[PDB]
Amino acid sequence: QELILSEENKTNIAVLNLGTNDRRNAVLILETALHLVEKYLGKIINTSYLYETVPVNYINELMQNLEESKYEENKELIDKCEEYETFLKNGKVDNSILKEVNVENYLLECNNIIVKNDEISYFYNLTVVVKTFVNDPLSMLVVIKYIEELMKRRIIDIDILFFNDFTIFMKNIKLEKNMIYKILSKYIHLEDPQEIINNMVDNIEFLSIPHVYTTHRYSILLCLNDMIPEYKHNVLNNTIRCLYNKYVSRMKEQYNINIKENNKRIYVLKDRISYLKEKTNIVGILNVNFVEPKRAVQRMFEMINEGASVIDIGGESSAPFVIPNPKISERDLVVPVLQLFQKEWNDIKNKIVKCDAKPIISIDTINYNVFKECVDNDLVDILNDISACTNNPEIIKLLKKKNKFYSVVLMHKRGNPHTMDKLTNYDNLVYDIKNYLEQRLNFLVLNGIPRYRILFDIGLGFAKKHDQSIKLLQNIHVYDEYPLFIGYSRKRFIAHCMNDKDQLLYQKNICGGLAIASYSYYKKVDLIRVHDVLETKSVLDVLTKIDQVKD
Amino acid sequence: LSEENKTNIAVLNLGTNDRRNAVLILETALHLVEKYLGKIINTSYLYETVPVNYINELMQNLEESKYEENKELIDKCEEYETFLKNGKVDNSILKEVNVENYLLECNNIIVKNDEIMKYFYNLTVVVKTFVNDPLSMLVVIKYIEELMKRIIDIDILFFNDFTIFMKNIKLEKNMIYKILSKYIHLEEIINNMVDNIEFLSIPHVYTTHRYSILLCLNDMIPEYKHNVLNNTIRCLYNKYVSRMKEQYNINIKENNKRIYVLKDRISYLKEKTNIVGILNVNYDSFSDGGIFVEPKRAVQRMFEMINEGASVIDIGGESSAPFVIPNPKISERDLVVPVLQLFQKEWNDIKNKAKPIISIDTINYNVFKECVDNDLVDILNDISACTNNPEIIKLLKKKNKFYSVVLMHKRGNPHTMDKLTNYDNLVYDIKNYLEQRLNFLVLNGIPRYRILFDIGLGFAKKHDQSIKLLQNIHVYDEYPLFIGYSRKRFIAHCMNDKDQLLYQKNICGGLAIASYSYYKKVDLIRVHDVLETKSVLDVLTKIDQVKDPNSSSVDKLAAALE
Ligand SMILES: Nc1ncnc2c1ncn2[C@@H]1O[C@H](COP(=O)(O)CP(=O)(O)OP(=O)(O)O)[C@@H](O)[C@H]1O
Ligand SMILES: Nc1ncnc2c1ncn2[C@@H]1O[C@H](COP(=O)(O)CP(=O)(O)OP(=O)(O)O)[C@@H](O)[C@H]1O
Ligand SMILES: Nc1nc2nccnc2c(=O)[nH]1
Ligand SMILES: Nc1nc2nccnc2c(=O)[nH]1
Ligand SMILES: [Ca+2]
Ligand SMILES: [Ca+2]
Ligand SMILES: [Mg+2]
Ligand SMILES: [Mg+2]
Ligand SMILES: [Mg+2]
């Protein structure tokens, strides 16, 4: 009865599904659940993209009033997780403390639930892998229910897809109200904190591991495919990917349905849903290299009104052979600017209808101290790390708070402003860069950064000869699955494109970049980082008009 | 030979190997066909198909024709209409073989050629011919070839509905002469000519065997059905195309390219988007608030456009800009001829050490005449599609030169056009309209491959109609396409030092249409901002320039294996 509470400290692997119905607040709801998962269950070491599929204020108050977890939070960076490796390859783990069933019983008891439900809205999903300290899936389900109830004070559905290699079907669970309190107290410092426990007792009816709908719901396979394509559970007839591929082509050969069209991958730049590949956002460049705060802030507002969705501020040139002037530090160039902008914006904020009108703010820095100060003072939304967080990976710690995730651009480069033009050997240029960006994403994702908040940038001009920059453009389709951010603006390789004073070359350069804006638009590049906002907006508006068929 | 005063319909084929001079050679041939055989009343595109200074001084000393050249415009041709439908015609003076005997006499020549063995530029033509019979025409044709002396081959593909095969042919060194003097004032060459003419086949033997004959004929007479053929030209053409795809896995069109001509050189249809720079003399001179025309500044602008990358200059002195009232004191001709004259001068001064094609945006015959006679221009840009004065068409042919023409669609004039925007079917009414204009120039001997289409963005179109014409630009995929969006109001309609932002937005909006045009493979775009447009096209072109067409798949496999 209380052998479910035995002293033994163990680490298990759980795979969860988080679903909501609320389009408006999906991000905030799912990420609140991510936070509570990380607080109350263990460590997030994988996430899928966010998807939209076809079959408020008290949250911010809740996060202030949470009971502490009996268990540690360790933010140190990890580079491998052994239990996860073991989970993936089906290696040896401890016997389940809960009674298992064989394949036949499971398959039978699954169908029986499916058929019953076959007698008797947009969904927003995300899956998670958690390195858990919770002893067993039922205990987990109790805590998961606590979390769902916290978030009500429907709105959030949290299912257990997997839990080690276990196979479990328990038909008639009834847990006495004091047993629930006893389970929650093992994991939480329990201290109205008692009345919640009442609602939970009728909620746990049975427990199926794997979850009943795991292979029967497209939206689950979609998420799992992002994270664990090669996983094979005893109870499944193939790997996650295979099962996923079959589901796609079957709907193409049992109906005439391309399932992808109804089920959209999402990325998040700040706090809203963006559908992958549906819009080319302009990112306006603000180089503060001496540029006076007031003037810098004027330029920011000129760019908002010229059409920029995002402003990318940098205080440190990375341009070829640039030696900076130590007279003034990066911090002192960027912070006063972002503070002034935050002031001006808040003055003129409550005078007009301007909240969604606020540009997402991006900082082009590799330096942890700079980003720590921006993040502490709520001055930025995105980290633009031209070293893909390799220069100081501690920075990745700054992308999470108790109730906040920040998004990040990972760019590819080699060397520094002085050596980079000399480091241009690649066995397989297009794929070496892709593979590198994937490894960097895997490292962030292993360390709890949501997959959907990570953007890829091939870094044109950084350790690329001009013909290699072009070739990276020519092959941009290899990023069709990923949120893609590129920066071609006023780079050398553009001039390399023309045939034959500096004002004439300045203009050829702006104009050559409008060509790459056109190309980008058709290639459905998600973000483009540009100096010339007005010009870029004009181009994208025209091309959008040409594409819009009128009724 | 005895019969007199009859008119016949004959289809010819013209061929050469000289890529460098295909235009000059086929165009000379044409001139001579029009001099010595009748009126050219149809042409095909020029095609490039895989299976020098002699001519200038030749043009001066030619023998005259016995029938009068007739440059008058026509709008139908009953005979030709009768040729197409296969209606009652006179009986053949030469001896007709029947169908099976023709079929087997042909196969024989084809088969003997298959065995006997162990870039082409083509152009078909239809002739309303005074000449009496296939064989006489062949004699005159052989004279024309030798008169041009392989350098030029001119076969006879049809003569009315005749089904003819003549097995053995000796023509007396003097029997040729009497035929040749029936049509010319003869003033050495017959010696060379004798054995040349061995036999005679009508239809020509290779008529349905050579793709490059079908291709050419499909332009002109797609629905034509000869007794000898199993179906219409269009069907045999389609069959030939699909069967090459099914049976040999070959896209026959890749090696058989449609050509259009701007000046003197070959252009490959859909292979390049050409910049055409705009020189408006009214705007160049009177936008200051100034009152005097400045030819120097104007010719300075021409040179500045050549260097910025324009392949073509479009000069105009009338303004069709909406609600714009042309200046009544200084005439079009005085805005235009002087600027052109100074240009041809300074071009010839700086010609020690590339010459831009010159287009003139006029609907006025007298203006065009003075320009063409003094060799000031290469192309007629007629925004009325030659309906303001169809006689302007005559000026597109000389005895030696041909000139190219842009036909634009419009309704009304600059004060009325904006109100004239009801179309039963916008996209197709305009295309049909342009097509019917082309049928009219062609019926009058304007070479097909010298006619360019322009939908006329902004000319009697609402802004959404201009966009719609762009959305549906693919309907011109078979045709040489010339468009002008530069700075038109419909660009602003696409958007969301206040007028400078608006003029910036407008140049930039255009560069977007330049890109779209580039990808839609528009042949010519007429622009104000040349440097900007060239920069755009250069960059798009470099992105498309692949080193190895396979590497993307190969590098992908290499990566997967590692
Ligand atoms: N792996 C698992 N994860 C979550 N709940 C499970 C489960 N196995 C069994 N259950 C039972 O089913 C209940 C889940 O309730 P809900 O999630 O609200 C049903 P639903 O969302 O309408 O459809 P779903 O079960 O297909 O998600 C749990 O309280 C528990 O009684
Ligand atoms: N309908 C026709 N038109 C032109 N020539 C014809 C003809 N019927 C027979 N001939 C004769 O056959 C010859 C045709 O071949 P030529 O033009 O001389 C070189 P070819 O290109 O190798 O032959 P091809 O064009 O038949 O392939 C002519 O010289 C002509 O005397
Ligand atoms: N992510 C990113 N940041 C940059 N910062 C400066 C110059 N280029 C770039 C670039 O191309 N990408
Ligand atoms: N052919 C052509 N000519 C023009 N002349 C003036 C203005 N626009 C145009 C145009 O769009 N097309
Ligand atoms: Ca944790
Ligand atoms: Ca004639
Ligand atoms: Mg559920
Ligand atoms: Mg030949
Ligand atoms: Mg021949």
The domains of chain B are located at: 8-51+63-84+93-260, 269-544
User: How close is the nearest chain A Cα to the Cα of B464, in Å?
Assistant: 9
In this complex, is the C-beta atom of A515 within 8 Å of any C-beta atom belonging to chain B? yes
Residue A42 · residue A134 · CB < 8 Å: yes
Q: At what angle do helices A466-474 and A429-446 cross, to 10 degrees?
A: 70
A204 is in an annotated binding site: yes
Residues 6+ apart with CB under 8 A from B32: B144, B147, B148
Pick the CATH number of B8-51+63-84+93-260 from 3.40.50.720, 1.20.1250.20, 3.30.1360.180, 3.30.70.560: 3.30.70.560
Q: Which residues of chain A neighbour B561 with C-beta distances below 8 Å?
A: none
Total CB pairs under 8 A between chain A and B: 119
Closest CA to B447 of B27, B158, B24: B27
Cα(A306)–Cα(A300) distance, rounded to whole angstroms? 10
Which positions of B make up the binding site for Ca(2+)?
Answer: 34, 38, 69
A390: buried, middle or exposed (CB in 10 Å: 19+, 13-18, 0-12)? middle
In this complex, is the C-beta atom of B556 within 8 Å of any C-beta atom belonging to chain A? yes
Residue A479 · residue A494 · CB < 8 Å: no
**Dihedral of the CA atoms A373, A375, A376, A379 (nearest 10)?**
90
Query: Which two three-digit tokens encode residue A300?
Result: 């920011």
Closest CA to A409 of A456, A478, A362, A359: A456
Measured over the CA atoms of residue B65, residue B71, residue B72 and residue B77, the dihedral's sign is positive
Rounded to 5 degrees, what are φ and ψ at B462? -70, 160
CATH code, A277-547: 3.20.20.20
Residues 6+ apart with CB under 8 A from B149: none
Residue A365 · residue A314 · CB < 8 Å: yes
Contact at CB, A504 and B531, closer than 8 angstroms: yes
Closest CA to B123 of B154, B84, B92, B97: B154
What kind and span of H or E run contains A254?
none
Query: Which two three-digit tokens encode residue A278?
Result: 């549906």
Cα(B532)–Cα(B522) distance, rounded to whole angstroms? 17
Contact at CB, A539 and B509, closer than 8 angstroms: yes
Cα–Cα distances in Å, from B255 out to A431, B237, B241, B269?
34, 15, 12, 13
B329: buried, middle or exposed (CB in 10 Å: 19+, 13-18, 0-12)? exposed
Rounded to 5 degrees, what are φ and ψ at A42? 145, -140
CB of B526 shorter than 6 A to ligand 4: yes
Residue A126 · residue A48 · CB < 8 Å: yes
Q: Which residues of chain B neighbour A434 with C-beta distances below 8 Å?
A: 559
* Topology of the domain comprising A12-266: Alpha-Beta Plaits (3.30.70)
Say how many CA atoms lie within 13 Å of A409 toward its Cβ.
Answer: 30
B42: buried, middle or exposed (CB in 10 Å: 19+, 13-18, 0-12)? buried
Query: Which two three-digit tokens encode residue A464?
Result: 């690329």
Pick the CATH number of B269-544 from 3.40.50.720, 3.40.50.300, 3.20.20.20, 3.40.50.920: 3.20.20.20
Tell me how crowded residue A419 is: count the other CB atoms within 10 A of its CB: 10
Cα(B377)–Cα(B74) distance, rounded to whole angstroms? 26
DSSP A130: E
Residue A502 · residue A256 · CB < 8 Å: no
What kind and span of H or E run contains A219?
helix A218-227
Cα(A296)–Cα(A309) distance, rounded to whole angstroms? 17
DSSP A227: H
Q: Do domains B8-51+63-84+93-260 and B269-544 have the same CATH topology?
A: no
Cα(B362)–Cα(B376) distance, rounded to whole angstroms? 13
Tell me how crowded residue B215 is: count the other CB atoms within 10 A of its CB: 23
Sheet of A407-411, strands arranged across = A454-457, A407-411, A382-385, A360-364, A310-314, A281-287, A527-530, A485-486
Of B535, B539, B559, which has the smallest distance from its Cβ to A431's Cβ?
A: B559
Angle among Cα A528, A530, A536 to the nearest 5 degrees reads 85
Which positions of B make up the binding site?
Answer: 34, 38, 69, 142, 145, 150, 153, 155-156, 196-199, 201, 204, 206, 210, 529, 532
Of A307, A534, A550, which has the smallest distance from its Cβ to B504's Cβ?
A: A534
Residue A436 · residue A410 · CB < 8 Å: no
- DSSP-assigned beta bridge partners for residue A527: A281, A485
Closest CA to A127 of A16, A258, A256, A233: A16
SS3 sequence, B461-483?
Answer: CCHHHHHHHHHCHHHHCCCCEEE
Of A475, A512, A540, which has the smallest distance from its Cβ to B539's Cβ?
A: A512
A217 is in an annotated binding site: yes
Closest CA to A135 of A8, A229, A307: A8
Report CA(A112)–ligand 7 centroid distance (Å): 17
Whose structure tokens read 């006179």?
B90
Query: Which two three-digit tokens encode residue A151?
Result: 């978030």
DSSP A322: P
Cα(B405)–Cα(B452) distance, rounded to whole angstroms? 6
Contact at CB, A474 and B546, closer than 8 angstroms: yes
Query: Which two three-digit tokens encode residue A128?
Result: 């998670």
Cα(B93)–Cα(B114) distance, rounded to whole angstroms? 33
Atom number of ligand 4 nearest to Cα B484: 11
In this complex, is the C-beta atom of A549 within 8 Å of any C-beta atom belonging to chain B? yes
Cα(B258)–Cα(A469) distance, rounded to whole angstroms? 35
Closest CA to A540 of A549, A526, A551: A526
Ligand nearest to the CA of B68: 6
Cα–Cα distances in Å, from A34 out to A84, A127, A312, B342?
19, 10, 27, 76
DSSP A478-500: GGTTS-BEE--TT-HHHHTT---
A253 is in an annotated binding site: no
Closest CA to B294 of B348, B347, B330, B344: B330
Say how many CA atoms lie within 13 Å of A42 toward its Cβ.
Answer: 25
Residue A106 · residue A233 · CB < 8 Å: no
Pocket test for ligand 1, best of A132, A206, A217, A233 (most atoms within 8 A of CB): A206
In this complex, is the C-beta atom of A497 within 8 Å of any C-beta atom belonging to chain B? yes
Rounded to 5 degrees, what are φ and ψ at A395? -50, -35
Contact at CB, B540 and A519, closer than 8 angstroms: yes
Query: Which two three-digit tokens encode residue B485?
Result: 């969006």
Exp. method: X-ray
Q: Which amino acid is at B531?
A: L
Report CA(B152)–ligand 8 centroid distance (Å): 8
Which residues have any ligand 3 atom within 6 Å of their CB? Answer: A 318, 364, 384, 386, 409, 411, 457, 459-460, 485, 487, 529
Ligand nearest to the CA of A202: 1
Question: Would you tell me which residues 334-353 of chain B have a C-beta closer than 8 angstroms to some C-beta of chain A?
Answer: none
Closest CA to A460 of A501, A412, A418, A397: A412
In this complex, is the C-beta atom of B537 within 8 Å of any C-beta atom belonging to chain A? yes
First to last CA, chain A: 67
Ligand nearest to the CA of A527: 3
Cα(A256)–Cα(A249) distance, rounded to whole angstroms? 10
Q: Which residues of chain A neighbour B556 with C-beta distances below 8 Å?
A: 431, 478
